[PDB]
Structure formats: structure tokens, C-alpha cells
From a paper:
The crystal structure of recombinant Ng-[name] (rNg-[name]) protein was solved at 1.65 Å. A second expression construct that lacked the N-terminal signal peptide sequence and instead contained a C-terminal 6×His tag had a predicted length of 111 amino acids with a Mr of 12,372.05. The latter construct was used to purify rNg-[name] by Ni-NTA affinity chromatography and size exclusion chromatography (SEC) in soluble form for crystallization and structure determination and also immunogenicity studies. The overall fold of rNg-[name] was an eight-stranded β-barrel, and the structure was comprised of two sets of four stranded antiparallel β-sheets (β1 to β4 and β5 to β8), with the disulfide bridge between Cys37 and Cys120 stabilizing the interaction between β8 and β1. The superposition of Ng-[name] and the Brucella abortus PliC-lysozyme complex showed a conformation of “loop 4” incompatible with lysozyme binding; furthermore, helix α1 of Ng-[name] would also clash with lysozyme. We investigated this further and provide a conservation analysis that is based on sequence alignment of [name] proteins from different Neisseria species. Interestingly, there is little conservation in the region around β6, suggesting that this region is not involved in formation of a conserved interface (compare the green region in Fig. 3). While our analysis revealed some conservation in loop 4, this loop was much shorter in the MliC/PliC family of proteins, explaining why the loop clashed with lysozyme in the superposition. However, the analysis also reveals conservation in the loop 4 region, which is involved in lysozyme recognition, and hence interaction might occur through this region using a different binding mode; this would explain the difference in sequence length in this region between Ng-[name] and PliC proteins.
In this study, the structure, biological properties, and vaccine potential of the Ng-[name] complex protein (Ng-[name]) are presented. Ng-[name] is structurally homologous to Neisseria meningitidis [name] and MliC/PliC lysozyme inhibitors. Ng-[name] functions as a human lysozyme inhibitor. Thus, in summary, Ng-[name] is a stable, highly conserved protein that functions principally as a lysozyme inhibitor.
Numbering used by the authors: 5 to 107
Write the structure that this text describes.
Amino acid sequence: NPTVAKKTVSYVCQQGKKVKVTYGFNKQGLTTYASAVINGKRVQMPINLDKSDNMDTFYGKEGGYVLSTGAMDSKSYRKQPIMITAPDNQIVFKDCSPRLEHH
Ligand code: NA
């Protein structure tokens, strides 16, 4: 198993939507998957190495839910805004930033 740690981020999205996403991480601090409960079911989206590059990271298969964001690693992951697209190509969580909890 290359996943050795997992970390969770809470987001606030447009249209008052909220989503919590758990990311798996390997020993190098890269990510291995994104997971979120979507319509009361957990959806597991492995990192898509066909689509991901130096600028953009994508999780999920073609035909499924896809999380898209910027560069993701153990340094960056809690600062990156995300979006989640449904299998039918509708954006179901839009313009999601990680929540400020600072006093
Ligand atoms: Na993030």
C-alpha cells in the first residue's frame, strides 16, 4: 500500500454547499486518492495520473466523479481550492475553498 497517511479538509463552496475531502498520501508527501461523501455515499477517487500534471491534479476515472485542483502535496494541500464534477459533467461542488477556522 503506497498510502501511509490520510488528511481531511473541510470546504465551503458556492450555493451554500460544503464538502469534506480526505486525501491519501504516500511517503514522499504526494497524494494517492481523494474521498468524499457525495449524496450520503462515500466516493473514492484515485489520483488520475493520465490527466494530472505539474499544474493540475485530477482524482477519479472518466465516467465517474472527478475532483480537480492545483498541485497537491503535503505542503500545498490545505490551501488549494477544488471543484467536483459529476459523471454527467455537471459541477456539483463549485469554487470550493478550504474553510478559515482562525480566531
Ligand atoms: Na485543499
